[PDB]
Design a protein around this motif. Structure first.
Motif, PDB file in Angstrom:
ATOM      1  N   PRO A 273       0.812  -1.231   0.000  1.00 17.53           N
ATOM      2  CA  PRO A 273       0.000   0.000   0.000  1.00 17.53           C
ATOM      3  C   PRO A 273       0.834   1.264   0.000  1.00 17.53           C
ATOM      4  O   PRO A 273       0.431   2.271  -0.596  1.00 17.53           O
ATOM      5  N   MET A 274       1.993   1.241   0.658  1.00 14.79           N
ATOM      6  CA  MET A 274       2.905   2.371   0.558  1.00 14.79           C
ATOM      7  C   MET A 274       3.398   2.540  -0.874  1.00 14.79           C
ATOM      8  O   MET A 274       3.364   3.648  -1.419  1.00 14.79           O
TER       9      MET A 274
ATOM     10  N   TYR B 104      -5.492   5.661   0.408  1.00 19.88           N
ATOM     11  CA  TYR B 104      -5.849   5.112   1.711  1.00 19.88           C
ATOM     12  C   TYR B 104      -7.303   5.382   2.080  1.00 19.88           C
ATOM     13  O   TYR B 104      -7.829   4.726   2.984  1.00 19.88           O
ATOM     14  N   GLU B 105      -7.961   6.327   1.404  1.00 24.02           N
ATOM     15  CA  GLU B 105      -9.393   6.523   1.600  1.00 24.02           C
ATOM     16  C   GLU B 105     -10.212   5.379   1.017  1.00 24.02           C
ATOM     17  O   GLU B 105     -11.207   4.964   1.622  1.00 24.02           O
TER      18      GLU B 105
ATOM     19  N   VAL C 214     -10.360   6.130   8.308  1.00 22.57           N
ATOM     20  CA  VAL C 214     -10.396   5.825   6.880  1.00 22.57           C
ATOM     21  C   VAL C 214      -9.250   4.939   6.424  1.00 22.57           C
ATOM     22  O   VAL C 214      -9.376   4.264   5.385  1.00 22.57           O
ATOM     23  N   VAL C 215      -8.127   4.887   7.137  1.00 29.09           N
ATOM     24  CA  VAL C 215      -6.979   4.071   6.759  1.00 29.09           C
ATOM     25  C   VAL C 215      -6.976   2.813   7.614  1.00 29.09           C
ATOM     26  O   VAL C 215      -7.261   2.867   8.817  1.00 29.09           O
ATOM     27  N   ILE C 216      -6.667   1.672   6.991  1.00 31.82           N
ATOM     28  CA  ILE C 216      -6.643   0.410   7.724  1.00 31.82           C
ATOM     29  C   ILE C 216      -5.509   0.399   8.742  1.00 31.82           C
ATOM     30  O   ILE C 216      -5.651  -0.143   9.845  1.00 31.82           O
ATOM     31  N   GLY C 217      -4.369   0.993   8.395  1.00 32.24           N
ATOM     32  CA  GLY C 217      -3.252   1.074   9.314  1.00 32.24           C
ATOM     33  C   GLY C 217      -2.866   2.501   9.638  1.00 32.24           C
ATOM     34  O   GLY C 217      -2.397   3.237   8.765  1.00 32.24           O
TER      35      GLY C 217
END
Ligand SMILES: *[C@@H]1O[C@H](CO)[C@@H](O[C@@H]2O[C@H](CO)[C@@H](O)[C@H](O)[C@H]2NC(C)=O)[C@H](O)[C@H]1NC(C)=O
Ligand SMILES: *[C@@H]1O[C@H](CO)[C@@H](O[C@@H]2O[C@H](CO)[C@@H](O)[C@H](O)[C@H]2NC(C)=O)[C@H](O)[C@H]1NC(C)=O
Ligand SMILES: *[C@@H]1O[C@H](CO)[C@@H](O[C@@H]2O[C@H](CO)[C@@H](O)[C@H](O)[C@H]2NC(C)=O)[C@H](O)[C@H]1NC(C)=O
Ligand SMILES: *[C@@H]1O[C@H](CO)[C@@H](O)[C@H](O)[C@H]1NC(C)=O
Ligand SMILES: *[C@@H]1O[C@H](CO)[C@@H](O)[C@H](O)[C@H]1NC(C)=O
Lengths: 49, 90, 152, 49
Positions: free
Chosen positions: B48-49, B66-67, C134-137
């Motif tokens: 994800p990064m 990330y939304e 809103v962010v999983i991590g």
């Protein structure tokens, strides 16, 4: 047939060097595309991406 | 075959197994490190990064991934299923 | 018969030379593009001007050819760190403008991609967007806020 | 290549702290010899026939 091929032995010398040239040029083609890295990176056992 | 008349076929230097091994090493490098392994030593990074930096390279701010990360992941999986189905149909 | 043999030799030589001409033209086009990109400026294309992050190239004269002395940028030493994509300060998620959040075990910093330059988490290098759930991590921290101590 | 595994995690990153300036050599041939071939001096010698 082979006795009369000595008059055209230079033609076969160009040809065998050409086919050898293509074969070695073909082996190098796979090395320039797939062998970009010199280290095999193993897939981690964790599949949570 | 085509070898009975002296038209011998020279086998390739690299077989299909190590070519698959070449691809899998590249696949693991591009999902665990991004582009650091292609320009030096491999640096570990979350996917994800890494997805955010590719978004930053196309003029998109990284805050949008990330939304809706689940939406993009579902879109990626559906696209993977679509190309696998399209390749199944030359 | 000698005529037709000599013509056959010249025709196969001309064909071979013309194929070598095509190959030399392709190599010349590649070298010209490499000069115009890597030498006359900095090329963003990765792994085109050598292995690593390209800076510049120094062309040198060669007999029937050309060489390029590329200047690359490869990292040498790296350190493992614990990272987080966002910071939850007061319900607002903070995202880095150009760096990435890193932690050495106790505190958190933001550092650039290709170098370790730890800095205090402040407002000038972070931007807010939306809420926190809103962010999983996500991890909890604070922002230094360089306007609060100066208004006193 | 070297068989190595990269430790992958959802909260693990690697930030480099040092760099080395390296120079890579690349060889591109752009030129070759320019030759001219004529039939009259090659195919024929000093004979008009
Ligand atoms: C992680 O980073 C923090 C911030 O730099 C370190 O805390 C400082 O450490 C220095 C070194 O002795 C001290 O002089 C400071 O007083 C510390 N500041 C604070 C606010 O604690 C911390 O030591 C680092 N930890 C590790 C394991 O490297
Ligand atoms: C990070 O901070 C949030 C909010 O400050 C924490 O969420 C609270 O968690 C407690 C118990 O875990 C609840 O009683 C509160 O109602 C929560 N508040 C909100 C606004 O959600 C969260 O637990 C913190 N995370 C960590 C790891 O400490
Ligand atoms: C980054 O790497 C360079 C290259 O090794 C380091 O420079 C060396 O540093 C040692 C000790 O300081 C010296 O004995 C060497 O003579 C240096 N070599 C050169 C070529 O300058 C440098 O110290 C490293 N930087 C960090 C922060 O670790
Ligand atoms: C950081 O630690 C992990 C495990 O804790 C290890 O796999 C990794 O190699 C370490 N990174 C470096 C640069 O030593
Ligand atoms: C990372 O993955 C592990 C294993 O699935 C999980 O327990 C952990 O909560 C994850 N951390 C984050 C920040 O998502």
């Amino acid at each position: 047939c082979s006795n009369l091929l000595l008059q055209y032995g230079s033609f076969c010398t160009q040809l065998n060097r050409a086919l050898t040239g293509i074969a070695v040029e073909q082996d190098k083609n796979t090395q320039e595309v797939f062998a970009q890295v010199k280290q095999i990176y193993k897939t981690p056992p964790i599949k949570d991406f | 075959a085509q070898k009975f008349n002296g038209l011998t076929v020279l086998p390739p230097l690299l077989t299909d197994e190590m070519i698959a091994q070449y691809t899998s090493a590249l696949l693991a490098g591009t999902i665990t490190s991004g582009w650091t392994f292609g320009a030096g030593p491999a640096l570990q990074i979350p996917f994800p990064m890494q997805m955010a930096y590719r978004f930053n390279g196309i003029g998109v701010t990284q805050n949008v991934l990330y939304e809706n990360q689940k939406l993009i992941a579902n879109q990626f999986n559906s696209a993977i299923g679509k190309i696998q189905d399209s390749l199944s149909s030359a | 018969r000698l005529i037709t043999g000599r013509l056959q030799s010249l025709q196969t030589y001309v064909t071979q030379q013309l194929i070598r001409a095509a190959e030399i033209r392709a190599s010349a086009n590649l070298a010209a593009t490499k000069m115009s990109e890597c030498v006359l400026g900095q090329s963003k294309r990765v792994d085109f001007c050598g292995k690593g992050y390209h800076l510049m190239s120094f062309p040198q004269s060669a007999p029937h050819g050309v060489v390029f002395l590329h200047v690359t940028y490869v990292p040498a030493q790296e350190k493992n760190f614990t990272t987080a994509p966002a910071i939850c300060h007061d319900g607002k998620a903070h995202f880095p403008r150009e760096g990435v959040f890193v932690s050495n075990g106790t505190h958190w910093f933001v550092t650039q991609r290709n170098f370790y330059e730890p800095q205090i988490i402040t407002t000038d290098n972070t931007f807010v967007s939306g809420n926190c759930d809103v962010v999983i991590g996500i991890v909890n921290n604070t922002v230094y806020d360089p306007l609060q101590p100066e208004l006193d | 290549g070297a068989e190595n595994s990269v430790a992958y995690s959802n909260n693990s990153i690697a930030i480099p702290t040092n760099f080395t300036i390296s120079v890579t050599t690349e060889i591109l041939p752009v030129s070759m010899t320019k030759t001219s071939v004529d039939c009259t001096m090659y195919i024929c010698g000093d004979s008009t026939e």
